[PDB]
Design a protein around this ligand. Structure first.
Ligand SMILES: Nc1ncnc2c1ncn2[C@@H]1O[C@H](COP(=O)(O)OP(=O)(O)O)[C@@H](O)[C@H]1O
Ligand SMILES: Nc1ncnc2c1ncn2[C@@H]1O[C@H](COP(=O)(O)OP(=O)(O)O)[C@@H](O)[C@H]1O
Lengths: 346, 975
């Protein structure tokens, strides 16, 4: 149920007026979300692609990334947050009765182009993460409407981030990664080994089901929360990084302030644009009009999906399996610069 | 082992020369080696000196300006001053050998002596020298001297005194024979082809083919054609190294792939520097003959060989279309990330990107981009460096600078390359070399892997401290000074690639750059030259295919095939492209440019101006026709309703008969003006962008040329064309006249060019210094007057661009290179904000910021970098201006009342005509937005009153005509 591999040909083709920059899968109902270089935010279902569910132009420029989440409360809706090149972040409300888009509010404050967005829920509290060319990651509060933390984890500008509880890792333009503890806002470790700027970085979430890189090593490091982080850059490589253990407000160890080359992998002909984790397999694409599936165990490209897009292919993602509230269904969507998108079913 | 420069193949001649060179060293006798470039003097002495543990090599390269202090600076890091004075080497066992390359290069003074030659003969004959700062005699004890030189018959080589060569044994080395070259390079090709055992039997034909190609290139391309057509075995070693690199970083090869790869390497080694297309075709036929006679495969032209490692993990030939699309997407990303430029990519650009990338991948890989200005030298260098991840360092050399700023910039660049291991591309323009000491620094940096002059003394000590700290950071075990400095120079050689940009190779400074011995034998000369007409066709089609083009009838003319360089004519787009290319060729031919490279900046500027002007004019014409059509339809509907079915409506209908007639006439002439819209748009664009630096006579001549060439390609234009009537609006005309323009149409035309240049900053060449006052009246108190010759000008300009005030910079012939990023309009858009880099710190652009450059010196000195980007406009007085000014002066000093009445009447008449034109505009707007009848009647009555006033005012013109006829003799004698 977790070893699903996509076929060699998509069953549906999505036509978009402009290039697709980001996609996201609805964890509950079969609806995929489509970007637009013109700045539109589409809504497409997996059975009738001939007509959009909704469409609007709220951004004067193209968008960079999208993310969704269905919140839970022990005391219930899907929230859409989108960042664009118009110096603003727009948070949208997705209704299910009439299946339209509703605008909640717009976030301002970033000095230049915002690029990545992360959303998480913990202790019945939700926040929105954000990084831009202002070389500062800014995490804001959805309910309060004000920022909660702002710090500089890199000399140059940060392109991609991810959040796992109280830790956040940043991917910048200067070929180095920085792990920072969010409530304290201090750097912990640095990672060298890259020669080209990072495109997207995310954690290797712990799963329980025998994957080498998705299991803890020792009891204390199991209690740390996470072991590995996966990062893709423009040197056509995706690198797996071993996080050193800090002094545990964590304190950086002077003798353990450097990362380690757990596993580096090659095989892409151009800049690896995105990464995703599903079971023992890692999915990725690049500018070489190809989609891959790299096994975490042997570190070898199992399947090559060649020439799915005439131009560049930008975005792909899977369903989250580490979260109990989200069922990891066997849906895959890929979006490309050729103004077309491919969705894989079964 | 091909990449290692210390490898030799022992032949008879090599071992003979090496043994006698070693014997002459061991005799404590001076040695001077004479031979043509590439003979192998450096090779034999390096070979003879690695096989000895008793001698050490110090490498000095002499240029046109080398002094004694350079020879001293190259040795103080190698030698210790001891008082036993005595200048001993730092080592106690090994001796020292002073390789002085190109001894003939240092020049004579005005009294026929060379300083360094006399210093060397003092070093050998007298065994020492007098230390200048404290006047003491230091005795050289264990330093030998080795000279390498070329025969004096070569150009740039000057005779050497016999008092020097008395003490120096002389050996002559000629070029190796063809058989020896074939043997040596079949050994090289066997070493290369060890990687491919399937084709190990083709080594000898490949080597003989390479040697034959070398001999035919050396015979055909001699110095008599071009000053840099110097070929040597070093070219063939570079060919071999490129072949090895492309084999090593490539896939499994076939025999056809080997032929194509070797041919591409030969193209990039031999035919990079070829200027004329005839020599390129000669090299193509020579390659065909060499392949046919030696290695018995498709077309082997330069553009048909596109080898690249961008599209895969290995170096291999790629298709054209996928490479073009990949480069277009990468360049869009580059414009999004580093700097935004409106550049479209063509095939020769793709080839230039490939060869620049090929050179930049190499260790110790430099460039000399020779070609016209605005060709794409530095922008493609930056793009290739961004693809490779290199760091761009453009030196901040400006006016009021000296060697100290260049030394600090190069020191910081070397420190970043070595200590910080930051891979760096260093781009040197021809305008960044102010003095010949700049060339000395560049030559020392390229010949060796350092500059010993900068880092000497306490600078040497802090270098040692920094390098020990960095090496201890990297965990490398080394203690000696020699190993540490070898690591230093290895890091410098590995992580630094100097790229040279030359715009005018005929200039003396650029000739010194090209003819420099270390800038020639180490760099990779890349003579791109002026754009060929195929490139112009590609860029022109690619930049006019995005506009609404086909909206009128077109008949393809029957023209000669030879004059058409584009695809066969099928619509007006190819006709427009051919017209623009042909006019560029004719303009550059008539200006007597000679063999000088021709800048395509005029062509690109005219293309962009045509695009924007035809867009604006078509929008305006479509809007005007829509308004006229809906007004006529509304009038017809109202007339039909009145006929089918009260006094005010009837009066309005009857009074608007003239407007209906005018609307019908404009509707009838819409077809005529749509026929001629493309033609006069082309004429206006070219007339704005090409004729800015021209006088009236040649402007009229080239306008006749443009009209004839436009009628040749069946593109219609306006027979009664006039640029003032087509661009200069009446509101702008009155604003300019009240701002202080002359009544001459030449000056209004020039200012119309000045204001209608929103992309390029205008150059105001006004000797009378009147345009400064005019523009100061134009922008009111917002304007500011700066100067290149004043102090604190940088801060004034920065404050002016923060506030957004309009800037006029005086003294344009003293151009300051710090504003070069403002000149090329390199703007970084910070979201809604625009920022630019001036000097050393970035500054914001407000949006209402305008830049003007003024110069009152005719026949001044405008650099080609400044010349190629600015809309240079001459303001030179002529016939009509003299006549008008003399007439005005004599009227003012004879009868001022009549002159005042005449000028007031002219101003009132033109104001009344403007009010009339705005009034018909108001009637058209009111009828388009359909109380109203009473307002229309009032406006019609106002029009009638103003027309009657003008008719009454037009009764004094014959008196002015009589005054003109009376004072025309005074005017013509004045002129
Ligand atoms: N065994 C050999 N015999 C003769 N020439 C050789 C041999 N091996 C290499 N060469 C050639 O000699 C050249 C060395 O020339 P070089 O000494 O750099 O010229 P210069 O004398 O102007 O410094 C190399 O490019 C190489 O091709
Ligand atoms: N193929 C092209 N299409 C459009 N513009 C071009 C092209 N090639 C060059 N340019 C123009 O040339 C400018 C950059 O030229 P640059 O490399 O700075 O010339 P140089 O090296 O002589 O200073 C750009 O502003 C661009 O407008």
């Amino acid at each position: 149920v977790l070893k699903w591999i996509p076929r060699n040909l998509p069953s549906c083709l999505i036509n978009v007026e402009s290039s697709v920059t980001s996609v996201k899968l609805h964890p509950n109902l079969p609806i995929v979300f489509v970007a637009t270089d013109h700045g539109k935010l589409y809504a497409f279902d997996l059975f009738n692609y001939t007509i959009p569910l909704a469409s609007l132009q709220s951004h004067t420029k193209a968008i960079t990334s999208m993310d969704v989440l269905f919140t839970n409360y022990t005391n219930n809706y899907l929230v859409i947050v989108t960042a664009s090149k118009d110096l603003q972040i727009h948070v949208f409300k997705w209704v299910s009765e009439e299946c339209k888009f509703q605008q909640i509010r717009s976030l301002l404050g970033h000095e230049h182009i915002v690029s990545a967005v992360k959303i998480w829920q913990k202790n019945n509290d939700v926040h929105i993460a954000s990084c831009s060319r202002d070389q500062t990651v800014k995490i804001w509060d959805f309910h309060n409407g004000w920022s909660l933390k702002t710090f500089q984890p890199h000399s140059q500008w940060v392109r991609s981030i991810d959040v796992l509880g109280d830790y956040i890792i940043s991917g910048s333009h200067d070929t180095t990664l920085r792990l920072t503890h969010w409530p304290s806002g201090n750097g912990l470790s640095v990672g060298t080994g890259h020669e080209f700027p990072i495109e997207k970085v995310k954690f290797i979430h712990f799963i329980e089901d025998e994957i080498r890189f998705r299991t803890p090593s020792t009891d204390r490091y199991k209690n740390w929360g996470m072991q590995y982080c996966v990062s893709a850059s423009r040197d056509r490589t995706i690198k797996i990084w071993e996080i050193p253990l800090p002094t545990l407000a964590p304190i950086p160890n002077p003798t353990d302030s450097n990362f380690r080359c757990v596993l580096t992998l090659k095989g892409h002909l151009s800049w690896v644009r995105d990464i995703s984790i599903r079971g023992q397999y890692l999915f990725s694409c690049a500018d070489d009009k190809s989609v891959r599936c790299w096994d975490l165990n042997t570190g070898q490209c199992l399947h090559v999906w060649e020439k799915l897009h005439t131009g560049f292919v930008n975005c792909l993602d899977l369903d989250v399996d580490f979260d109990s509230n989200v069922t990891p269904r066997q849906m895959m969507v890929t979006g490309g610069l050729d103004c077309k998108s491919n969705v894989f079913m079964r | 082992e091909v990449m290692r420069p210390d490898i030799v193949i022992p032949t008879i001649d090599t071992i003979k020369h090496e043994k006698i060179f070693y014997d002459l060293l061991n005799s404590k006798r001076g040695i001077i080696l004479c031979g043509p470039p590439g003979s192998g003097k450096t090779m034999i002495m390096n070979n003879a000196l690695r096989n000895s543990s008793l001698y050490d090599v110090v490498g000095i390269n002499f240029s046109k300006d080398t002094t004694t202090e350079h020879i001293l600076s190259a040795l103080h890091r190698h030698t210790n001053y001891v008082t036993t004075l005595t200048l001993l080497p730092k080592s106690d066992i090994k001796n020292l050998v002073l390789f002085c390359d190109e001894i003939n290069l240092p020049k004579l003074d005005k009294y026929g002596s060379q300083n360094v030659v006399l210093f060397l003969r003092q070093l050998m004959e007298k065994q020492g020298f007098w230390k200048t700062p404290e006047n003491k005699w230091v005795t050289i004890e264990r330093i030998h001297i080795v000279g390498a030189c070329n025969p004096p018959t070569d150009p740039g080589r000057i005779p050497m005194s016999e008092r020097f060569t008395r003490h120096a044994a002389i050996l002559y080395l000629g070029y190796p024979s063809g058989k020896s070259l074939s043997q040596i390079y079949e050994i090289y090709y066997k070493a290369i082809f060890k990687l491919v055992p399937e084709f190990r039997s083709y080594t000898e034909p490949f080597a003989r083919a390479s040697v034959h190609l070398y001999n035919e290139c050396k015979a055909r391309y001699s110095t008599g054609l071009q000053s840099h057509y110097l070929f040597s075995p070093r070219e063939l070693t570079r060919l071999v190294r490129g072949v090895y690199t492309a084999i090593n970083t490539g896939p499994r090869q076939t025999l056809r792939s080997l032929i194509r790869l070797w041919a591409y390497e030969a193209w990039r080694i031999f035919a990079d520097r070829l200027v004329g297309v005839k020599e390129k075709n000669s090299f193509e036929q020579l390659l065909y003959e060499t392949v046919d006679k030696y290695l018995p495969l498709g077309n082997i032209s330069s553009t048909s060989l596109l080898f690249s490692g961008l599209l895969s993990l290995d170096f291999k030939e790629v298709n054209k279309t996928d490479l073009v699309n990949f480069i277009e997407e990468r360049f869009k990303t580059f414009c999004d990330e580093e700097l935004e430029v409106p550049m479209v990519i063509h095939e020769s650009m793709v080839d230039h990107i490939l060869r620049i990338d090929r050179a930049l991948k190499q260790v110790q890989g430099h460039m000399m981009l020779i070609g016209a200005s605005r060709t794409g030298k530095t922008i493609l260098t930056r793009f290739v460096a961004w693809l490779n991840g290199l760091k761009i360092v453009q030196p901040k050399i400006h006016r009021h600078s000296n060697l100290s700023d260049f030394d600090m910039i190069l020191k910081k660049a070397i420190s970043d390359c070595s200590l910080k291991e930051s891979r760096t591309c260093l781009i040197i323009d021809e305008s960044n070399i102010l003095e010949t000491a700049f060339l000395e620094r560049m030559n020392t940096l390229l010949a060796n892997a350092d500059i010993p002059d900068l880092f000497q003394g306490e600078e040497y000590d802090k270098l040692l401290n920094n390098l020990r700290n960095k090496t201890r950071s990297l965990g490398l075990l080394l203690d000696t000074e020699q190993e540490l400095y070898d690591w230093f120079v290895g890091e410098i050689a590995k992580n630094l690639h100097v790229v040279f940009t030359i715009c005018d190779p005929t200039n003396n400074k650029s000739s010194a750059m090209i003819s420099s011995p270390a800038l020639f034998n180490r760099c990779i000369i890349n003579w791109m030259g002026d754009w060929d007409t195929k490139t112009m066709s590609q860029v022109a089609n690619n930049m006019v295919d995005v506009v609404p083009m086909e909206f009128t009838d077109f008949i393809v003319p029957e023209v000669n095939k030879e004059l058409v360089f584009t695809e066969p004519i099928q619509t007006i787009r190819d006709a427009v492209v051919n017209i623009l290319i042909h006019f560029d060729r004719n303009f550059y031919q008539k200006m007597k440019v000679g063999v000088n490279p021709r800048s395509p900046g005029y062509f690109i500027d005219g293309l962009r101006a045509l695009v924007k002007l035809v867009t604006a004019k078509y929008q305006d014409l479509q809007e005007n026709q829509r308004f006229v059509n809906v007004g006529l339809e509304k009038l017809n509907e109202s007339v039909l309703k009145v006929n089918e079915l009260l006094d005010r409506s009837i009066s309005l209908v009857k009074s608007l008969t003239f407007e209906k007639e005018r609307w019908l006439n404009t509707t009838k002439q819409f077809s005529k003006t749509s026929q001629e819209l493309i033609g006069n748009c082309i004429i206006s664009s070219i007339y704005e962008t090409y004729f800015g630096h021209l006088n009236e006579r040649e402007r009229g001549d080239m306008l006749v040329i443009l009209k004839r060439l436009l009628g040749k390609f069946a593109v219609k234009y306006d027979v009664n064309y006039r640029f003032i009537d087509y661009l200069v609006t009446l509101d702008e005309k009155m604003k300019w006249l009240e701002c202080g323009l002359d009544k001459n149409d030449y000056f209004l035309e020039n200012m119309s060019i000045v204001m209608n240049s929103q992309d390029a900053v205008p150059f105001l060449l006004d000797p009378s210094s009147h345009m400064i006052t005019v523009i100061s009246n134009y922008y009111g108190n917002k304007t500011v007057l700066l100067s290149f010759l004043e102090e604190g000008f940088v801060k004034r300009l920065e404050n002016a661009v923060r506030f957004g005030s309009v800037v006029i910079i005086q003294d344009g012939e003293f151009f300051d290179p710090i504003i070069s990023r403002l000149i090329s309009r390199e703007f970084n858009h910070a979201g809604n904000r625009v920022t630019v880099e001036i000097g050393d710190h970035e500054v914001d652009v407000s949006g209402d910021f305008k830049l003007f450059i003024h110069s009152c010196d005719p026949s001044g000195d405008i650099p080609i970098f400044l010349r190629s980007r600015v809309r240079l406009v001459h303001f030179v007085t002529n016939k009509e201006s003299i006549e008008t000014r003399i007439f005005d002066i004599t009227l003012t000093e004879e009868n001022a009342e009549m002159q005042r009445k005449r000028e007031d009447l002219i101003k009132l008449n033109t104001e009344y005509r403007l009010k009339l034109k705005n009034l018909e505009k108001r009637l058209l707007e009111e009828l388009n937005n359909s109380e109203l009848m009473v307002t229309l009647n009032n406006l019609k009555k106002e029009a009638m009153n103003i027309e009657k006033k003008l008719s009454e005012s037009e009764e004094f013109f014959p008196q002015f005509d009589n005054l003109v006829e009376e004072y025309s003799i005074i005017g013509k004698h004045s002129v």
